[PDB]
Curated annotation (Swiss-Prot):
Entry's family note: Belongs to the class V-like SAM-binding methyltransferase superfamily. Histone-lysine methyltransferase family. Suvar3-9 subfamily.
All residue ranges annotated as the Chromo domain in the record: 9-70
Compartments reported by the entry: Nucleus; Cytoplasm, Cytoskeleton, Microtubule organizing center, Spindle pole body; Chromosome
Protein name: Histone-lysine N-methyltransferase, H3 lysine-9 specific
Effect of W32G: Weak effect on methyltransferase activity
Span within the parent record: 2 to 69 of 490
Top-level taxon of origin: Eukaryota
Free-text comment about domains: The chromodomain serves to recognize and bind to H3K9me.
Subunit structure: Component of the Clr4 methyltransferase complex (ClrC) composed of at least clr4, rik1, pcu4, rbx1, raf1 and raf2. The cullin pcu4, rik1, raf1, raf2 and the ring-box protein rbx1 are components of an E3 ubiquitin ligase, whose activity is essential for heterochromatin assembly. Interacts directly with pcu4. Interacts with mlo3.
Main function: Histone methyltransferase which contributes to the establishment of heterochromatin by specifically methylating histone H3 to form H3K9me. Part of the Clr4 methyltransferase complex (ClrC). ClrC preferentially ubiquitylates H3K14 and ClrC-mediated H3 ubiquitination promotes clr4 methyltransferase activity. Clr4 functions as a reader and writer of H3K9 methylation. It sets the H3K9me mark and afterwards this H3K9me mark is recognized by the chromodomains of clr4 and swi6/HP1, which then recruit additional clr4 leading to the methylation of neighboring nucleosomes.
Post-translational changes noted in the entry: Autocatalytic methylation of specific lysine residues in an internal loop (autoregulatory loop) promote a conformational switch that enhances the H3K9me activity of clr4.
């Protein structure tokens, strides 16, 4: 594009989440503009049993974003 550096802000780690009446999770939304630069996709939690890091930024963020309790 312009610079041959590693790669600037490469997406985030969880852009949204869908809970259930149980107040628990069920599905998550992951954005990625740097990659395709168009449209995001959804993936369930159980698959994020390897995105420990990604899930990590999210949790740390779960507090800030919205901010309630769940």
């Amino acid at each position: 594009i312009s610079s041959p550096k590693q790669e600037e802000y490469e997406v985030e780690r969880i852009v949204d989440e869908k809970l259930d009446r149980n107040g628990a999770v069920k599905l998550y939304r992951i954005r990625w503009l740097n990659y395709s630069s168009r449209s995001d996709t959804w993936e369930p939690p159980e698959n994020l049993s390897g995105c420990s890091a990604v899930l990590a930024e999210w949790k740390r963020r779960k507090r800030r974003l919205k901010g309630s309790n769940s």
